[PDB]
Amino acid sequence: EKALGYAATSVGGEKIAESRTSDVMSSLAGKIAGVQISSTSSDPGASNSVIIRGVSSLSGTNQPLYVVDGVPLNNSTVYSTDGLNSGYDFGNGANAINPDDVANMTILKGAAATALYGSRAANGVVMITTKSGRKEKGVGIEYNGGVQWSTVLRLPEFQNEFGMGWNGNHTELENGSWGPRFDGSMQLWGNVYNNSQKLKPYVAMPDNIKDFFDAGFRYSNSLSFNGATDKSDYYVSFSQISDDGMIPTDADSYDKYTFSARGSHKAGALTFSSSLNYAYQKNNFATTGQGLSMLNSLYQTPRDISIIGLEDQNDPFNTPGYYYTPYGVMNPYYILNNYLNEYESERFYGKFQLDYEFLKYFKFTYRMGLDTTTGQSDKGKPNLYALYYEGTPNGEGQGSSSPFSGETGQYSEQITRRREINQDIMVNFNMPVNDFNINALVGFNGNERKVSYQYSEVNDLTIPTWFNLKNSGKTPIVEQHMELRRLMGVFGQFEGSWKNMLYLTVTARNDWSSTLPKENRSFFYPGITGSFIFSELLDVITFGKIRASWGKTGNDADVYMVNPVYAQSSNRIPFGSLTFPLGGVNAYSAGNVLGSNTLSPEMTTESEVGLNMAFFKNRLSFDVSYYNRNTDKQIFSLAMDPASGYTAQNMNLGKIRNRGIELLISGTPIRTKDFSWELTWNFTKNWSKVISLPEELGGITTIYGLNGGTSMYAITGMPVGVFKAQVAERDPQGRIVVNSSTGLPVEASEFGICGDMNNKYQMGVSTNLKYKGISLGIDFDIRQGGVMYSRTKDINYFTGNAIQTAYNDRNPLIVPNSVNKIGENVTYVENTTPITSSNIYKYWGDGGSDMGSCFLVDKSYVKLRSVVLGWDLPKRWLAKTPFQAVKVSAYGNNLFVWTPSSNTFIDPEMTSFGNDLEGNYGEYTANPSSRRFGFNLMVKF
């Protein structure tokens, strides 16, 4: 251990937990070079993103294998398969872990020496080790009582010059602020109820959206029970977290319960030990998306409307039939109180380890793990038609363009079952010879993973608000699904050693995977790793290590990618489907993904060299690594021309490359006895480059995209995730071509490469003061890089609310370098046609001079990631009390974010498409980010 020949980072429980985050990975967001960590949103308590040395797999498995006490953990994600209309994320598998139960976390960043763990390790390993039994002075009880608040952070920057209206002209029913300039004048607004209409001063409500949000509240309770003997150790823990975030009502909720029992017993050569854990969660999400969702309704509010005034439903003007606008949006408070989107989960995981030392130098370890989960989701929406359409302005008075057509209600329930089994049988041989040392490990590993669900859906509810499968007069919808994959591999690992300073390691493994063709299921991968401590020098150099490694890691495909299938005939049409059966007849179609029985395995090959040194009395340290990864032949469903009879073919890709530098530098410029002061800086720079995608299929394939809109791709010579977007035409001198009649930009025929998803570099900056029992930590997270799509900016441009749209005071304008394109050869002429007041709305909604690509936003940000103020009480105070330790602790997270001036819209730490590669397409009006801060009380007994 720490004779390792590739990059890795150890973090200790206290740093993991001092932030009091509900989650074991969030607090490490910008603190480990090479390890990119992000939250999908600030909605409690959604998934988290952990990608190590860039995206190797497209698509879309790039999470690191989590290993707890020797056993692979399930890190499945539950997020919505349609982030356009119903965004929600219910959690990450790693989020079940109880912080406060972690004793050390070690992230193995390299994929050269991954025989001990399987092919899943190519994405990095997060090697978790839980607290065990220890003798202390008390009874062995640690209690943590937490409490925190979450207020909104970064709401879009709004224009406050123009109120409700369109085309420049005042309106009474708009969802936008393209109306006249604000004056004191008293104007009507809204709909008419009982021959009456509301009259309000036409003024701006600058804090109307800010005042809509609440302060989220979360209380946490953690208990641990601990003790040991010379033959035995026993740890038992419980954690409870309850969060209700800043969106009003309880629709943004997270309950978390964990229970754990860990014990070991030694008796002779024999040690037996077991770890068993139960994990519960309930989630409620304020769905996001382009439809009747809370936030999409919230942003399409004119700047003069008091949003906190739309809540009281006894004011009939706030009813869904008289709500002040009928334009694809309804009252946000009605959505939060009458829609359902719940998820509940039960999880059991654990292991049994049997250790038996024999013949002086041997150890037999048998370790089996089981991980099983049952999750149920229930979501519904009212029959808005039946309740409100008839005889109301927003319903019948808007005819077929009503927000209630055909919103007839639906309810669905899904129960999902997940079960993973791993078995390891190892013999370890460990013997010194002279100055040398030999340690060899041989073993067999066996893996079984299974997932199943049952889904049922009703539409057109009879009682309009009741969510139940009996509540429908129409045919219901069922779906069922399961996947089973199995793996067996055998592996050897030889660690050799000379003196205390020269370490060689040699791994190998060979796996048999069910997900590869029958006649090619076997794939072998070896590695080599060196470590040389060049500390052999007569105090100025505390430590001095040089590393090198070269190794491979194989990988298999996902389930069922080999044979042709026939699916139940359906057809996808824009915004709907036509599915069989009809009418009384069932039917099947040829599956549009072409399987391949000539696949080969995947093979990631990595080279890496590194350098670690420490100076003075450990007052200055640095670690630096240079890596070069190629994930080759990964099995992928590659895009194909539908005229071939299929829309994709499964085949082995070319290489995806990731090379770069990971750098950590820390030092203690002040170390008294009563006082310290540390500083830390870490730096990452990765160079993503898809090297080849099979030529025969064109060399490009979609990761995620909007039909006819902005799309993220993988292209043969470029970094992973390149955006193409809509762009205005230009003449040979670079002037923007505009339409001679409207004055509006004209599309440039083709898209439109406008950046990629990768940060150009990432880095973090941390300090840590310590006086007596006082301690303080301040962390900064800095990533400067690519671009993402932001519907938050899009909808706020379209709606006339973004400050950017108050440009030119909205007086008629000629685009400042316009040109008009003119028998059969082309001619360009200065443009004299202005954009009229009546069309300024459309200039900005389309994206201004940038057009569609306007809504790719600079991913960059600088963020005050976390702050921890710790108060460890003097032991003197506790002599007359049951307490062994009291640590009062005040903290804050995600406190402040600075972006470049081109991003006055979002905190870029957002997505609506999950926690992996597809989530890098961006945010589709995901809920705004939070400012989290609170207190923790720690009482040891």
Partner: protein, 479 residues
């Protein structure tokens, strides 16, 4: 660990998926394109409806400001080729019933005809070969027409007398009706060759010998199949009435003609002005223009005739209206034979069925004995215009794709010489029924739309895709 578990348990065993289980997906797939997405944009190009003043979904289809990257037919291209045509390929591999092979070749040929009437060129000879050819070349629309008509000739020649053995949702195993569909498709395509001046000599006598045999179909060739349920409605109703809000309002050239001829059909699928009780069509592409001129509050939804979605949910998808059959037959008698009565009798028949398909059976004499009475048609050109304008009316809310194609072939309705801005200032300038170039018009060369862009999915993955041309480049049969 047993490792032989990679057979996907969520689908049957491929040896249990037989022709009678696949074939019903062919016609359903075609109908979800030709009756939905394709249909939808064809209804703008043929100027049946426009974009409502208060929504924005089809701005760029009305103002012809879409491009290749707009992917306006990518879904349908996927449906027709990786859905219906691959399934058609699977049925011919699995069954040997000549009656089933005939109904598949017809739906096959029809699907290729829809593609060709869109992008002129289309993958055909090398299509549907999978990894053997992931990048099929796009044959010319004429190679295809001459080929799919060649496939039909052989398939009809292989019939032995046995009957169909497959679930037919179009004709229910009525082999006569499939023969008629093939003949109507030949009549349809034979005319395209003629008006393209390509091998016009022979294809004209073939056109004449078809009508002499009258071996066409009865009723409409439709997919009567849809239920007002989720995932089972009419495709176009699904997309536009359920999936989105109301986006279509009636278009000026369809209302003016329906209003000039005193046609009671103007109430079928069109609603009256919610503020005046009148029928009001929007000038093609003029949504943003009429808002500037008249004012925001004076050109909302209330001020324009909305398209009615009520008759949609269960409405079938049409492959070949009966009205259109006669209007194609009345043209043949008019200008290739020389019956004036047989053309009169086919013309009046077409209008009679169309009056009956809608809720107006027994009111055809309001058009046949008043204004469109044919008696008032002096020149044969005066008659063809009347035929072609009644075809255009009959295809409203039925088969928009065929109206766009038939508009392009016959070049009737005529293009108005007056501009949208002109027709808005004056009103006597406009001959009612003539098309209007879109007020905003993104075609650098002006005029009406003549084809669809190539599917972006084929652009990106098929290096043999022809190069992107502007919407104003015609297909191979329009001149």
């Amino acid at each position: 660990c047993d490792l032989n578990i990679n057979d996907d348990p969520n689908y049957p065993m491929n040896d249990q998926v037989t022709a009678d289980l696949i074939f019903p997906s062919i016609s359903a797939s075609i109908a979800s394109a030709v009756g939905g997405e394709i249909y939808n944009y064809a209804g703008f190009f043929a100027q049946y409806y426009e974009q409502k003043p208060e929504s924005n979904q089809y701005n760029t289809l009305c103002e012809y400001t879409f491009t290749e990257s707009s992917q306006q037919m990518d879904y349908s291209y996927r449906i027709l080729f990786a859905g219906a045509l691959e399934d058609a390929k699977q049925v011919l591999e699995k069954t040997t019933n000549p009656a089933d092979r005939f109904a598949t070749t017809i739906l096959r040929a029809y699907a290729f005809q829809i593609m060709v009437d869109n992008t002129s060129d289309s993958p055909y000879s090398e299509a549907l070969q999978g990894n053997a050819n992931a990048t099929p070349k796009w044959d010319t629309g004429e190679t295809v027409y001459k080929g799919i008509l060649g496939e039909i000739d052989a398939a009809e020649a292989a019939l032995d007398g046995s009957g169909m053995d497959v679930p037919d949702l179009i004709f229910n195993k009525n082999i006569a009706q499939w023969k008629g569909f093939a003949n109507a498709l030949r009549l349809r395509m034979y005319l395209r060759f003629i008006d393209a001046n390509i091998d016009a000599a022979s294809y004209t006598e073939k056109v004449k010998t078809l009508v002499q045999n009258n071996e066409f179909f009865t009723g409409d060739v439709k997919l009567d199949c849809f239920l007002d349920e989720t995932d089972k409605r009419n495709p176009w109703y699904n997309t536009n009435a359920v999936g989105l809000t109301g986006n279509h309002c009636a278009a000026y050239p369809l209302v003016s003609y329906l209003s000039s001829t005193g046609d009671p059909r103007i109430a079928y699928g069109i609603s009256k002005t919610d503020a005046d009780g009148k029928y009001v069509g929007q000038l093609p592409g003029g949504k943003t223009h009429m808002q500037s001129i008249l004012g925001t509050d004076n050109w909302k939804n209330k001020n324009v005739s909305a398209i009615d979605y009520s008759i949609g949910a269960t409405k079938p998808v049409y492959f070949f209206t009966q009205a259109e059959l006669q209007f194609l037959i009345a043209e043949v008698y008019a200008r290739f034979h020389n019956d004036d009565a047989n053309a009169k009798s086919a013309y009046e028949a077409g209008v009679t069925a169309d009056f009956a398909v809608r809720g107006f059976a027994g009111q055809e004499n309001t058009i046949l004995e008043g204004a469109c009475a044919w008696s008032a048609a002096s020149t044969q050109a005066d008659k063809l215009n009347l035929i072609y304008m009644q075809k255009w009316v009959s295809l409203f809310y039925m088969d928009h794709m065929e109206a766009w194609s038939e508009i392009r072939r016959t070049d009737c309705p005529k293009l108005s010489s007056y501009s949208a801005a002109q027709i808005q200032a004056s009103e006597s300038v406009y001959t009612p029924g003539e098309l209007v170039a879109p007020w905003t018009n993104g075609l650098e060369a002006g005029g009406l739309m003549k084809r669809m862009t190539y599917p972006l999915s084929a652009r990106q993955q098929n290096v043999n895709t022809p190069a992107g041309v502007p919407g104003s480049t015609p297909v191979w049969w329009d001149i």
